[PDB]
From a paper:
We obtained separate reconstructions of the pentamer and of the hexamer to nominal resolutions of 3.1 Å and 2.9 Å, respectively, and used these to build atomic models. In the hexamer, as in the crystal structure, interactions between neighboring CANTDs around the symmetry axis are mediated in large part by residues P38 and M39 in helix 2 contacting residues N57 and T58 in helix 3 from the adjacent monomer. In the hexamer, K30 is not a pore-facing residue and may interact with E28, while E29 is freely exposed to the centre of the pore. Within the central pore of the hexamer, we also observe two IP6 densities coordinated by rings of R18 and K25, but density for IP6 coordinated by K25 appears to be weaker than that of the pentamer suggesting lower occupancy. The spacing between K25 residues is much larger in the hexamer, and its position suggests that in the absence of IP6, it could instead form an intramolecular salt bridge with the exposed E29. In the average hexamer structure, the R143 sidechain is placed above the helix 8/9 loop, with Q176 pointing downward. This is the conformation observed in all lower tilt structures (and in the average structure shown in Fig. 5E). At interfaces between three hexamers (independent of tilt and twist angle), helix 10 engages in a symmetrical three-helix bundle, held in place by a hydrophobic patch which includes residues I201, L202, A204, and L205, as previously observed in helical arrays.
pmcThe mature HIV-1 capsid is a conical, fullerene shell that encompasses the viral genome. It is constructed of a lattice of approximately 200 capsid protein (CA) hexamers incorporating CA pentamers at 12 highly curved vertices. The surface of the conical capsid is dense in protein-binding sites that mediate interactions with host machinery necessary for transport of the capsid through the cytoplasm into the nucleus. Here, we present structures at 2.6 to 3.5 Å resolution of CA hexamers and pentamers within in vitro assembled conical CA-IP6 polyhedra from multiple lattice contexts differing in local curvature and geometry, alone or in the presence of Nup153-, CPSF6-, or Sec24C-derived peptides.
Numbering used by the authors:
A (entry chain A), B (entry chain A), C (entry chain A), D (entry chain A), E (entry chain A), F (entry chain A): 1 to 86, 96 to 221
């Protein structure tokens, strides 16, 4: 993070060892389940590009995913260089924190019109983590179907946990929650849900189908 | 949370990783048992809408419940937009922290007459968590009955833990504690309780029925 | 708790998540063993009524006990209303933190002559926790008796752990420590203790009876 | 502890929940092994009598020992009252924190000539914990003897761990370390030790007898 | 680390016990897997040479590796002495924190033109940890080959985890990711990958080969 | 530690309970393996003699070692008294923190020419811990020999972990690393090592002998 020193100048605060241990535990245990993106944004809230790189580089496992992340960051950095022909003006590799010093990063982040290289880079990281979260999804929403004995609440949990990983825009997810959620319910359950009509909320669907 | 910087301006404090881990543990382990509402209010005490969204989005399981929560927040945000036709005046989606920046959220929360979008949104969240807590209750108070060998204290614990989840107003809960608590006691126990008359406190009921 | 802001005004400090987790662990594990009262007073040291309510409401189990606590607090609040007919003058429900805002609570607690609603309410809570601790005692001091093979130290531990829960005033507890402690010792042990005469301290009793 | 407020007046700091949990763990697990006295002095370093009472009252087990502690504190408080016939002048029960408010305790501890009631009371507590540590010693130093197959280092560990609990003054402990340590060694080992003569240090004794 | 005292002079902050326990856990558990270098740089962010030596000296196991580290630091210190013939000008052993006091180290690190002996020494340490990480790699990238039944994602994880340890420059690693990654895939998988042509990204390779 | 109060005077900071628990865990678990000396110096970084005594006195086990430590400190204190015939001038027992108050210790440590009794005493402690670490070494370097099937890396780890405990000066340790390390290698391994000649570094030795 960045903290102002008592001497009246902008200074780095090192990302806490407790925060790094929390992030490493998150990635190693949850294995790019979609709640990894909000944990990244939460743990990384004030991060410089050096702090962001520290979070990525300390992940030990999943080096296939962490490579997909690096090469996503490289194409985002390339598009930045294309959009911004040449404090310095930061190149994409400066925002990615590879060709810039910590003092340049703080210089940009605290400039009079701030150039928020920590936020820009955290966007490119979250774009890469999105791609990874989609790829690590073990199944796709059209293949989520309710078992003949399965509680509708457990099927709904599976459906929406899969729908978090799915790529499509909110208009398509709206269509999925309207149509697929009913269509993939089991034969007894689906009758209950159809009897509600198309406007049923998820609360109405679950409470109507509770204990079917 | 919000904290004033030493430079004399309002600034964000990121929700602590320890607080996020505590909240995620609460939701994942206690699975919307009613003590989740007070743990939410306790852990979320100073939260901006960005902090509130961070707490909701980091929950990994229970995505059926977390969807019921989101669509509750959306209808609360819609009613806000209806009640408040158009710093900006915050739209419901601004209070829900989706269409507003963190700097707008802090701007409202620290305005000279403060517009407390963190508190307003935390109300809408607690309304959704209430609906979820009721739905995740495995049984209803009229079906809580004492076993013929069950200690009256364990039945009272089951009864009042169920009565926390129940929807009804305090006048109805008063009626439930007066009538159902006696009526659903086992045949030996119920005689002891009836002998106290209708005015008995819960201490009087439990101490009279101890070791029946 | 209450903390003065750097801007020169009284402000809330939220009860720490670590303190809440510690209190919840205390209540859930120790199940109103008498050391719950001092842990409450220790963890709750600076608490406003909102903080006190947060501590009570986050307990998940023991909802029979937590109901006995609420209805104790209600009768204490009723006696306060009776003793104090009508910053505002706080009603009993204001001190219990149900009809008062956090800003009213801090207003009273930091008034020029402070009205210490956090301390008053913590007294009513400890009165209720006392009643609960007595009721959750599995046995009573006149039924604590030493086994023929049991070490006198283990019997003394059982006796005084029971004597903590017992209701009676210190004059009665003095009589209990003088008479019952000897009278309920096992037949070999009781001879050793009687040989000391009535003035023996607990150290003298235990050291004389060690390894009997 | 005591901390000066930013408003320029002496104020209480509540004993940390982590410190209380550490003390309770110490007492419950180590069961008045002699390292409990230094852990008490370490955890209690700045304590007021209210903090000291909080540490004692939160111990759940060992209520025989905690009673011996209370009645030791009472006789120390009685001797204080005898030595000091009557801010107020603190009575022994004021120093024990039972008849004094926290504001009186801080008033004495921060008086212009400070009256250090926290240190005085911590002395009386450590006197009681000493008596308890001696009584909870499972054996006495004259009964610590080396087994015929036992390593001299393990016997030395047993001997000095017992010698910590023993009551006697340093002159007597010096005699014990000189004479009993050799005299109670096993028959082969004792020959090795006798060959060193009476002036041998414990390092010389252990290194000479290593691997006997 | 270094922190300015409130008296207006540069002062040491001791490396936290939590940070030391975290580093010792990292080295002892992860056993110079390549994520040890970023954990070192993360935990050591503000370190003086005394703090760096404290991190190295507290490692208990792996004393073969920690000797390779010391003798790497010695040759780096020798090259520094060669490059810099003779506050003092720091000798290599001063930068390694062996012949310099903590007050000299802080004197250099806070000099008007700062001489950043903590950063210089942390470079020499990371050079030694690199050599160790390469040597502790159980296999080399040309020997990483996919099993006939092994998922391509697990092979990619093994390949890139090995490629982290490998010595070669980024141009050689680029060649390895282009050619060896395909060449060492199993016979069915390798056909899928070859069908993409040479320009395929790792995302394209993994998504094309998913569930082969 | 020592911290300046906001009132402008030097004051004690109590050694943290987390630091004491960390030290007690270190000593009890690692049992004077040589990494105990750097953990002591790390955890004790700012310690007064009272803090140092608190660290020693809270160790529960190993009372043979802790006695060797005390009597080492006593002879160091005696040599100090001999070297320094008589704020006061501190006697050796004042530096050992037994005959001095905490306010005398802080008085010396913050004197205008500081008399650093905490550092002096920490030296005497580390001298005693060295003697203990040597004595608790289960074997000596001339008896460390490689098994016929044992990996050379595991033998090197055993050798250098033993060489940490060994008493001798760096010139003798240099001779040991040059000659004994080869001489005590197993018959196949020793041929590989001899083929390198006498100038081989430990990296060269281990990499040449890897997988023998």
């Amino acid at each position: 993070p960045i903290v102002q020193n008592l001497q009246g100048q902008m200074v780095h605060q090192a990302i806490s060892p407790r925060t790094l241990n929390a992030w490493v535990k998150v990635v190693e245990e949850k294995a790019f389940s979609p709640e990894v993106i909000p944990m990244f944004s939460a743990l990384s809230e004030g991060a410089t590009p050096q702090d962001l790189n520290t979070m990525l580089n300390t992940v030990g496992g999943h080096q296939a995913a962490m490579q997909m992340l690096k090469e996503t960051i490289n194409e985002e950095a390339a598009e930045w260089d294309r959009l911004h022909p040449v404090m310095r003006e930061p190149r994409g590799s400066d925002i990615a924190g590879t060709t810039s010093t910590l003092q340049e990063q703080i210089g940009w982040m605290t400039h009079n019109p701030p150039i928020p290289v920590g936020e820009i880079y955290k966007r490119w990281i979250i774009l890469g983590l999105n791609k990874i979260v989609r790829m690590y999804s073990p199944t796709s929403i059209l293949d989520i179907r309710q078992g003949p004995k399965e509680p509708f609440r457990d099927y709904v949990d599976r459906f929406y946990k899969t729908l978090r990983a799915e790529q499509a825009s909110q208009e398509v997810k709206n269509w999925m929650t309207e149509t697929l959620l009913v269509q993939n319910a089991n034969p007894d359950c689906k009758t209950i849900l159809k009897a509600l009509g198309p406007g049923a909320t998820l609360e109405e669907m679950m409470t109507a189908c509770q204990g079917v």
